[PDB]
């Protein structure tokens, strides 16, 4: 019902405002059943349609939204639907740097334990946010810690003390996105993604070290990716390359119960 509610249900009702209490209860559902934990994700879409159409409000919307972001989000099949709505919400022109900074840092934290499909979604999603709100370049890089060859020895000593005394101030448990102190932190997590096993994913992560020439990226070119598409895509590669070998030789592929390819694995 919730999946089709926004499109195949609301437009055909005479007084769609009657659905809000159902939707708000849906958006506020908390249950011990894990399978019911996805309900706010689906209910969000229908709720936004009602808010848009009649100027209707949900209290502490962003604070509730900050709560919904969790690792389970990165693995649900409805991840693509959620982020599409996130683009609209976080395109607002009355968003503070701290509020945006919290969504940034939490998402980057989640990408560490995320499927590449989710990572492919986040990396352009974040570039749009950082581009939209220029003040948040601190988290990618802070100029204070850069070393210049010309800096005097005293500056070198002062810089050394600054590096020693730094501590990450970002709190993961704070539910208010304005108080997490994310803006004072940095995005170490995105840097790790530069070493992602998949080459194409790593190149996307490499973009942050590159100048921010591009204005934005189309989310819909990035949202609905599954591994099977990654499997279909690699097979349908434009460029074909010659297979290569391993000069190193292993006497036995598996370990027993000379050279063993898989120590700790036996037949």
């Amino acid at each position: 019902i919730l999946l089709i509610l926004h499109k195949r249900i609301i437009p055909h009702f005479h007084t769609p405002t009657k659905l809000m209490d159902f939707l708000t209860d849906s958006y506020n559902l908390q249950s011990s059943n894990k399978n019911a934990g996805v309900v706010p994700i689906l209910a969000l879409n229908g709720l936004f349609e009602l808010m848009k159409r009649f100027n209707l409000e949900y209290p502490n919307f962003y604070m509730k939204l900050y709560q919904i972001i969790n690792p389970d989000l990165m693995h649900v099949k409805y991840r693509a639907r959620f982020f599409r709505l996130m683009d609209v919400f976080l395109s607002s022109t009355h968003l503070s740097a701290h509020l945006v900074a919290s969504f940034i840092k939490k998402l980057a934290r989640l990408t560490l334990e995320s499927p590449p499909s989710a990572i492919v979604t986040v990396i352009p999603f974040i570039y749009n946010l950082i581009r939209k709100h220029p003040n948040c370049m601190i988290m990618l890089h802070n100029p204070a810690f850069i070393s210049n060859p010309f800096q005097t020895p005293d500056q070198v000593a002062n810089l050394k003390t600054l590096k020693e005394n730094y501590v990450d101030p970002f709190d993961v448990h704070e539910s208010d996105p304005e108080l997490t102190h994310a803006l004072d932190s940095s995005l170490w997590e995105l840097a790790s993604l530069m070493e992602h096993y998949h080459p194409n994913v790593a190149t996307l992560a490499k973009i942050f070290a590159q100048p921010f020439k591009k204005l934005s990226y189309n989310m819909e070119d990035f949202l609905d990716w599954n591994y099977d598409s990654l499997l279909n895509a690699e097979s349908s590669r434009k460029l074909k390359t010659l297979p290569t070998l391993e000069f190193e030789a292993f006497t036995n592929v598996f370990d027993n119960e000379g050279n063993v390819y898989l120590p700790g694995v036996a037949w």
Binding site: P134, M137, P149, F150, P211
Partner: protein, 229 residues
Amino acid sequence: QKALPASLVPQAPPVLTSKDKITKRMIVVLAMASLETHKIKYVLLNCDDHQGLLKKMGRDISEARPDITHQCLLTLLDSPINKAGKLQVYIQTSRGILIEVNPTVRIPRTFKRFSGLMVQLLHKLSIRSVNSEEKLLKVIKNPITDHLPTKCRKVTLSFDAPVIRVQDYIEKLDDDESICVFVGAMARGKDNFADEYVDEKVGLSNYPLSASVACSKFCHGAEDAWNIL
């Protein structure tokens, strides 16, 4: 504590021009340049290639070496200061012709091609880019001073003059003003070509210095002085 620039992509510093006089810059005047053309085809008159013809012209061939001028601009143009866009180059031909070298230019390294460029500049008065967007070399009206910055220091290269550290000289000097260096591309001659315009003459080294070497030493001096790197 400050907020960062909106765009952090590196942007090329502005290409300095004679019209702008405020900006701090290093000017160098390659004085007494021997750039002459004569129909045989008009060829940049060379000390070695054309000895009889320059004899017919009556001009001493010893001061007919545009190679010294070419070498100076090569090391000058390829210096980091030029690539950093804080250097503009002036050339005063011995005949009395003043040439503008836009910092953007990239001359040919081979001297034969360079001679091809010089003959044309003298005839057309100008040089235009391959993409036709900016005039790289332009002959202009003498005297130099009107093209020189409004607040500027002038010095010449005199071997007899006291030896000074260029880094110290630039460091002790002010910031709003500008520095001109008058380099004699001539092989041999009295260092009075720019006496009328200069206010004081300085030396760089106890030992004799070539024009190409001497200017390269100075541009380094400004680059260390100015933190150009």
